[PDB]
Amino acid sequence: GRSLELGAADIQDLESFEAGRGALPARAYLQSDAPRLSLNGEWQFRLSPGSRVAPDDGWQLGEALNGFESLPVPSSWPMHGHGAPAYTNVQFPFAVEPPHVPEANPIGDHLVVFEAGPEFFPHALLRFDGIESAGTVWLNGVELGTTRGSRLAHEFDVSGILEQGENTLAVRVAQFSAASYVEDQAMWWLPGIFRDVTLQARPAAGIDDVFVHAGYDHITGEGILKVEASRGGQAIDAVVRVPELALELAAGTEVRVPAVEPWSAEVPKLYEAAVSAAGESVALQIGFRSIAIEDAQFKVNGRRILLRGVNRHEHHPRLGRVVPRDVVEAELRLMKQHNINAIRTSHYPPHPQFLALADQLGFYVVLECDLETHGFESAGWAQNPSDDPQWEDALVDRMRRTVERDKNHASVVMWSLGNEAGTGRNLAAMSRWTKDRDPSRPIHYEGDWSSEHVDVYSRMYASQAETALIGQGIEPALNDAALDARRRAMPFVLCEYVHAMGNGPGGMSEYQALFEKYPRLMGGFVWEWLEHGITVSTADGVDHYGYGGDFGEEVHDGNFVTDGLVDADRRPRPGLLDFKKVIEPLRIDVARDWTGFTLRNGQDFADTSAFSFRYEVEADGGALDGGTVDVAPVAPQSETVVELPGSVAALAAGLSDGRPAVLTVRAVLGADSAWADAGHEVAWGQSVREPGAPVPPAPVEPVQVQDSELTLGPVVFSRATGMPTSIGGVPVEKLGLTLWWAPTDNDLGREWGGADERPLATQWKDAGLNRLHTRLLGISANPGQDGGETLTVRTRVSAADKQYGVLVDYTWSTDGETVGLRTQVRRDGTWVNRGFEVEWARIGLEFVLGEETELVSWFGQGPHQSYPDTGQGARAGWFSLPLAKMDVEYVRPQECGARSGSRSAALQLGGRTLEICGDPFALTVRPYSQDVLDAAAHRPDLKADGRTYLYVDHALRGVGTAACGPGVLEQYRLKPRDADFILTLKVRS
Amino acid sequence: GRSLELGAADIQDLESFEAGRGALPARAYLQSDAPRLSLNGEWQFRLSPGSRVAPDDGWQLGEALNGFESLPVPSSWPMHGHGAPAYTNVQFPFAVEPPHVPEANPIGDHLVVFEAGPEFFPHALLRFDGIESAGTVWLNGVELGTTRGSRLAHEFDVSGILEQGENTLAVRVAQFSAASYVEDQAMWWLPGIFRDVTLQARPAAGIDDVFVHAGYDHITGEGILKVEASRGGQAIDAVVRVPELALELAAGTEVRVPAVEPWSAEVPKLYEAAVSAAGESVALQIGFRSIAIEDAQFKVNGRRILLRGVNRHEHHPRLGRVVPRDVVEAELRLMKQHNINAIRTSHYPPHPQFLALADQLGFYVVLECDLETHGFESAGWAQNPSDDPQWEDALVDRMRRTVERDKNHASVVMWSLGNEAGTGRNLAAMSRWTKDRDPSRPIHYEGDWSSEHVDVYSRMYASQAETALIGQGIEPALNDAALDARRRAMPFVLCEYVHAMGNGPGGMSEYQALFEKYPRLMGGFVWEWLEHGITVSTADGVDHYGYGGDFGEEVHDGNFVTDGLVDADRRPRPGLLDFKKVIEPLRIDVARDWTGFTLRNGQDFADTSAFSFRYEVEADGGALDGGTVDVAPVAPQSETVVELPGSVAALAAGLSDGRPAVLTVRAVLGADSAWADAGHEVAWGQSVREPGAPVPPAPVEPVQVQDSELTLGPVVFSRATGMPTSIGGVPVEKLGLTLWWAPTDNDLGREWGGADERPLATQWKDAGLNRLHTRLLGISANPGQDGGETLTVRTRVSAADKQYGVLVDYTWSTDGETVGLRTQVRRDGTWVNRGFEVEWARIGLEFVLGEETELVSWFGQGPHQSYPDTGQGARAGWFSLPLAKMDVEYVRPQECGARSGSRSAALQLGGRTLEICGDPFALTVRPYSQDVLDAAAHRPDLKADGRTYLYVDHALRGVGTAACGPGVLEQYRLKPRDADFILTLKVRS
Numbered sequence A, B: 001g002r003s004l005e006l007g008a009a010d011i012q013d014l015e016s017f018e019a020g021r022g023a024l025p026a027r028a029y030l031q032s033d034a035p036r037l038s039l040n041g042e043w044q045f046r047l048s049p050g051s052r053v054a055p056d057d058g059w060q061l062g063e064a065l066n067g068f069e070s071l072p073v074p075s076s077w078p079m080h081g082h083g084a085p086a087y088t089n090v091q092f093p094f095a096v097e098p099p100h101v102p103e104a105n106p107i108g109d110h111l112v113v114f115e116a117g118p119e120f121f122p123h124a125l126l127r128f129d130g131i132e133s134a135g136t137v138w139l140n141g142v143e144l145g146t147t148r149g150s151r152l153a154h155e156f157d158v159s160g161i162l163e164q165g166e167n168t169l170a171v172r173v174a175q176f177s178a179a180s181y182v183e184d185q186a187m188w189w190l191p192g193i194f195r196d197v198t199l200q201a202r203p204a205a206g207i208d209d210v211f212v213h214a215g216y217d218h219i220t221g222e223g224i225l226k227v228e229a230s231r232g233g234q235a236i237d238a239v240v241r242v243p244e245l246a247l248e249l250a251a252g253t254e255v256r257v258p259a260v261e262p263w264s265a266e267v268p269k270l271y272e273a274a275v276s277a278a279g280e281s282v283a284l285q286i287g288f289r290s291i292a293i294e295d296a297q298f299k300v301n302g303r304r305i306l307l308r309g310v311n312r313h314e315h316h317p318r319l320g321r322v323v324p325r326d327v328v329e330a331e332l333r334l335m336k337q338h339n340i341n342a343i344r345t346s347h348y349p350p351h352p353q354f355l356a357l358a359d360q361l362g363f364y365v366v367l368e369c370d371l372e373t374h375g376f377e378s379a380g381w382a383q384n385p386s387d388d389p390q391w392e393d394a395l396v397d398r399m400r401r402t403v404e405r406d407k408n409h410a411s412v413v414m415w416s417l418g419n420e421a422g423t424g425r426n427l428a429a430m431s432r433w434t435k436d437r438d439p440s441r442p443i444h445y446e447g448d449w450s451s452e453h454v455d456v457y458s459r460m461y462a463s464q465a466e467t468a469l470i471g472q473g474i475e476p477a478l479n480d481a482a483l484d485a486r487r488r489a490m491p492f493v494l495c496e497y498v499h500a501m502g503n504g505p506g507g508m509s510e511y512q513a514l515f516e517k518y519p520r521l522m523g524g525f526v527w528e529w530l531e532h533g534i535t536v537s538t539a540d541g542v543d544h545y546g547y548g549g550d551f552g553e554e555v556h557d558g559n560f561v562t563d564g565l566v567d568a569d570r571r572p573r574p575g576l577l578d579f580k581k582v583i584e585p586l587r588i589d590v591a592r593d594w595t596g597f598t599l600r601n602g603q604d605f606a607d608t609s610a611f612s613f614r615y616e617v618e619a620d621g622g623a624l625d626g627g628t629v630d631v632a633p634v635a636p637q638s639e640t641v642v643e644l645p646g647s648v649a650a651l652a653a654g655l656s657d658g659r660p661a662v663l664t665v666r667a668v669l670g671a672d673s674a675w676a677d678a679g680h681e682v683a684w685g686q687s688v689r690e691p692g693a694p695v696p697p698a699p700v701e702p703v704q705v706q707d708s709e710l711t712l713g714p715v716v717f718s719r720a721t722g723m724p725t726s727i728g729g730v731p732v733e734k735l736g737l738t739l740w741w742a743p744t745d746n747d748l749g750r751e752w753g754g755a756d757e758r759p760l761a762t763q764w765k766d767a768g769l770n771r772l773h774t775r776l777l778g779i780s781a782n783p784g785q786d787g788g789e790t791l792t793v794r795t796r797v798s799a800a801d802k803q804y805g806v807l808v809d810y811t812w813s814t815d816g817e818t819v820g821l822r823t824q825v826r827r828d829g830t831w832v833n834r835g836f837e838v839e840w841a842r843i844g845l846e847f848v849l850g851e852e853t854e855l856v857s858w859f860g861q862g863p864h865q866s867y868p869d870t871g872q873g874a875r876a877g878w879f880s881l882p883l884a885k886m887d888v889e890y891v892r893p894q895e896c897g898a899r900s901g902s903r904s905a906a907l908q909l910g911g912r913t914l915e916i917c918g919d920p921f922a923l924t925v926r927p928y929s930q931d932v933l934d935a936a937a938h939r940p941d942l943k944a945d946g947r948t949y950l951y952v953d954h955a956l957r958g959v960g961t962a963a964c965g966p967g968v969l970e971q972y973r974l975k976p977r978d979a980d981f982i983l984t985l986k987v988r989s
């Protein structure tokens, strides 16, 4: 049996169950004075479709290069025209038959030439901080070894192989390997050398690894310091210095520092330090803090903390898995600016530079190992690597490298074994290894609800209801009494919650109230921080984001990648603006009589000395009063009542009733910080004096009659239809009832529970809410006042093939100045379809106007959108925006931009202005129709058609988080019902 | 309360529950010598969007016409650019709130000027044979009345209103009315005056109505004749004459004719007749036949008959509901040419000219009333007009007019109350009325399974299994013993079965065998005769059919309209070719030794004297023998063994074994008939001498080896992939396994039963059968014979995210002339997905070739396609066709064109020819890919890409009728399994 296949040897290596070979022991990423040369820059690159046709020519030596072109390094090579991105959620892009790999497997050959000076001898190494997913490395033709673990560091000794002067480094990178089976994160598949490549010397009498142990005794205030140092795995002599604390001690010994200032996300105190031996010195930043679990609470420095967190993937719209440092610093400052205090590195270790920034700015970090086997769930977890003993060594290695690299950073308060990888013996081995190596950080893993091998109980997307049961410690018991006992003593954290995809997330406040009420609840991490949008440039310079499927992939999960609080360029979504308010660290309850406000300090450690408390009274015209009030600092977890100047209460008392006015109290930064300038807003509260009920016009104008038209003051009606065609000279091309909106991403998902497995969008489509039809029943003019008349138009709205409907009556009235419009809705028949009760998106009206709108003004909530279960961040005030800025640039267009709680509005159409008033309504204005919005898959598919689509809603439905997790909560649902609402219009030129 | 709405009076009339007003009594359509003038021609026409804007100007008088243009009459006015067609299946296109109508309701004003000569006085009438759906008629400004019942005749007296000379006739037609609620047939909605408009004089002493009663005593052979005649509802004096029978008798008296030749679809004997009084004479055609039910059988003239039927809608691709007479005669001849003997006028009376043609050519007709309320089912039948007493008069009227018009035609053997209209008191009133008026024809209605008010038990799409239970009279009992007793004594008919949508129908033979075995089974009517395709002409002159949705309708049911045995232009689909064979009236079983054949006469009345029995022996070269054999006529329902000339058996006996040869016996017409010429084929049978097993080549050629290629005789392989790239100079761009085909219309429907409600196409999509991926495992050359070698390529086929797969091994061998190819398939893992066992469409191979193919030849079954549960009409022989004629022009492209039972094949590519041989396989050749075929929604979306896609299948799955009714029967399913098949190839230039 002759064997004639090509590349069988390269494939066997890619199919290996083992960790990479030929590498130095795993250690910490350390700032050293040892000489170093970054090989980052312009490399040469060649791509083959698979191993069997990957040329075995002499390319590794660098001479006679055939078929190479320039490429930057680090890089995600699909970001530069070589192949294309492919995004899948749970599903693998290849056949599930481990350890085998497909035949279509991009192979990337990388090569660079560099100069090695004398200072890199006799000893040196090469360091690779990230290769996705399988790398083989040669130096001057000699093989160093292989890399496994795509976001993990590898180091190769080049002593006696690195030559003085010019050297040639070659790296072969395969996209898919056996390791892909354990790297099934929901994100873009992006092969490449995507992190630093560095040459580092290792002088004699140096330092290879360091392990900081900096604890805090919260009773005495002492610091407990012990800095370990080793060479070749052996503890060595070395001296530690921290100038600020008047300390010089030996490595390996534990000392009590009489008084330290503890480290926390709120106060990230960092003492500079150096560990030095004869040949090498290491620069450290040390944060004193101790982590402990007691009374079923997660405590730092003796206090239960509340995690205000997000899940952070690493992604950049033009460079993929390469995130420039300027972008890292930016987004982390942006996080702090929105009151975030915690980060989960979903689902792999980040760039090693991330850790120091986290220590400095202040975040509680859950550092997570690179491991996820989600794609094995659909087959009942059969062949899951997490329980296959042949994978033990490879998975322990992943955890080892994860722990060693970042074990010195005070910001890491939990080690996480991975994400959605089931349960198995290998996961238990990873946990046992970590607990032995570093018992100073509790262990996290959500995949095993029994929680046998962890220290905190973690779940994702648990309902508000179950969260409250857990907060009270009365969730259902595990069958094993011993394991149930353990878990009931564990604090609870939501590693992912309030899925922030598209319009939403809804129901954040409900979670937060539980967090504040129940100590056992640690808090939660929003999924997720950013949208993984990829910029696509088109003809005429139009720029938009692409998502799953837009790059010609055979298997994908669509727009699930754009599920973030900010877009790929870090521009806030409305959800982040709401999130900031929900998690605000201070609560300000302004008194109704404007005499003062209650101030609760929600922080865990800091008092209120960093904040300046300011007040301002705003009214119709401008601002009437304002200033700053001094507050004796308030301790954490306590409250006080702050008096306001009597002048404020006097304004309120002498306010002619019916005049609108808003008192706003804010807590801003008194001075610059590392993450924001002075005056940055942190918390706020308001008290509103509402405008009185709008005076309904006197019906003293009669109805003129003609053959095909009616007129009632500034309004013109069509006799045939009964609907306005003009108001004050403004063409009304249509007016009608609305019960539907263009489905959100959440409306496109299932609400599990109940016998109805259809998404809300499908329920609506089956019911006909998107294609309503109106029948005219009657037109009638009725006696008004002193000659005038009202005009009642009676209609019935329904849909083809349906028997249910609603009766809508429009009653118009006018005095010549302002048009009054009453609308009555009455449901007719039983609103059931395919055996389930139909629900409504809204109860409102759609005005279609023939003119374009330039500007929208309103008194209500703003500046940004607000729906019944969102809008926490929208405050009471006066707002005005150009039309285009009323919209929201979601990647898949969908319902958005409604302004709930509006009392008045004003649209500028050319030279005229249309004013709407009435009891609280929601306001939306768009230059396109609802059907155009529902059809559009990307922003370019939206086109203005010269009209103005105006929406005035009396009732609205919530948005929820049904795309992943709970749907709209009961209190925000909208069942069919009768309704009645009044409204006044006016046009002025 | 002033009332200001427009058109409220016209709308109230459209909402009327009552029949049309002001019309003459319902009567028969009669050929009379009274003067007549057809007003058909070029009319003037105007369209308004609704009643409220329909002008009330002076248009009815004909002077100062504003906005009218020319339009033909009769017409379906959406067929001429006024609006557009809209097709819905079950669902109404308007809100379901009877009797109300929508505001978007096209109003069509029609007008013509004509001359009335002296012979139209003093009495005359105007006759309208069809107006959809509500007409108001004026003559010279004077209102005559209104029409209700869209396919029913109305007559209006114009005495004292018709003026001598020039007259002006005006008709206002509304598309939607209260009557639309009872005209919910599955078809295009097409308003208009779509049938004849005729002026007819009514001289004094004339004849208004006639009622023929022509029975047959099958014991004596006597005819029982009684011709009734009436004027103004009163029986009158009149004399009846039938020359051929030597008869002159008075109307109203019953006589025994000593000897008549009975009428039947097989022998449609018609005696000419005339009923005459002083002023008028009527021409009649009389067929003597008596209908009776006894021993739970449906009998004509004392014999149980077998219905070979189709459901006939009226439709024309360019004129809509207007079917020219030349097209009627054509399609009915086409029906007879395919052995059909029965017609159901689904679901309304046809054009009155249809009846005479049915009497002449010979069909058993189920004449069905215009009534269907299907759209009320989705709401639990609430508000169903069939049980609403306010609709009684309007529904009795529909049945009255239905019965009166056609009561004289022997071809009508059943009256049908309507279709899918539920159960209700009005349906019972329609039945009571019919039984009293005409007790000579049993009553049919499927909507009430209890069968309380009918004479035959009717069902639609009952499984073969339930049909067999009913054939034995052991179906489950009704709860009411008295009704169960009645129904068990009733014969059973399938008014709709073997849904003929797209590829199919499958499972026809199984039904037919039950029809022949069980007397209680009357037979069945295929759904349906024609596709309702509408021709759409595009730039460059390309012509294709449109279906539901292609005309911009808001609500539609897609391609369900193209569900016919022939296309809109009456070109046969493969299903009709199979249907003809299944229902063939004679069975011919040719003996294996070629000594003779068994002949069963399946007819009910006629013997075999009309047929000439002919034989022919065909072989490789040409024909070897042939002739005609004389058969003593065989009586109905008996059989005989016909000897063939000894010369035929001698050829078979002296045939060198392994040589293929086919003996075919045919029954053709001995002489011309009214529906076909002499030599037309009616029945056939065959005996085949198969070719011997193909000799596998001697493996005496070795494997040449190169860096990137292997070669084994005329074959070139790629070392990387292991797959052919050449055979004899022909580029092979790809070769691989197939388990999937582009879903048929049947595959897009649900198979109710079992916990899996997904259509087969969705099951396949979820499982990944459409996106298979192959991994190379090994390549190996093995010792052959006298130096030669075999080449085994080992592969594993699967799909992304799936663990199941198949192992496919290709073993090649050659002697230099012919390539031998063995293929072994072994399933690997459990083929389950989303909790249900995956099924396969096929087990085969796809050859993709770089050259185009001009011609395809094969020995097997043809000329037309054949799948496991179809192809009855495909016979054994030798066939050759240009590539384009191997395809099938279904309106929605889908899997089709496979040739099952193939033993050899030959493709001509330019100058060369590729030959395939082996054990029985299925052959398909296309100029495009399977994905292009699945994506295409219409024919133009198919584009040849310069390649040749060749499919060789070892196993195939059935097609069934799951689009509506049973899916693939158990024995034709294809579960995943191991398989093995051999095959030889050869290229000759």
Ligand SMILES: OC[C@H]1O[C@@H](O)[C@H](O)[C@@H](O)[C@H]1O
Binding pocket: A265, A266, A335, A336, A337, A338, A339, A340, A341, A362, A585, A603, A606, A682
């Ligand atoms: O103590 C106040 C601060 O608390 C931090 O945890 C948060 O990240 C900051 O944005 C700020 O709110």
Ligand SMILES: OC[C@H]1O[C@@H](O)[C@H](O)[C@@H](O)[C@H]1O
Binding pocket: A422, A423, A447, A448, A449, A450
């Ligand atoms: O092994 C994976 C499973 O683990 C269980 O603890 C959990 O309840 C399941 O939902 C699933 O995640």
Ligand SMILES: OC[C@H]1O[C@@H](O)[C@H](O)[C@@H](O)[C@H]1O
Binding pocket: B265, B266, B335, B336, B337, B338, B339, B340, B341, B362, B585, B603, B606, B682
């Ligand atoms: O008796 C033979 C004939 O029977 C008729 O019913 C049929 O319509 C004809 O096509 C032919 O088959």
Ligand SMILES: OC[C@H]1O[C@@H](O)[C@H](O)[C@@H](O)[C@H]1O
Binding pocket: B422, B423, B447, B448, B449, B450
């Ligand atoms: O009233 C309509 C119903 O009539 C019943 O006899 C039948 O079983 C049902 O399927 C439905 O057709």
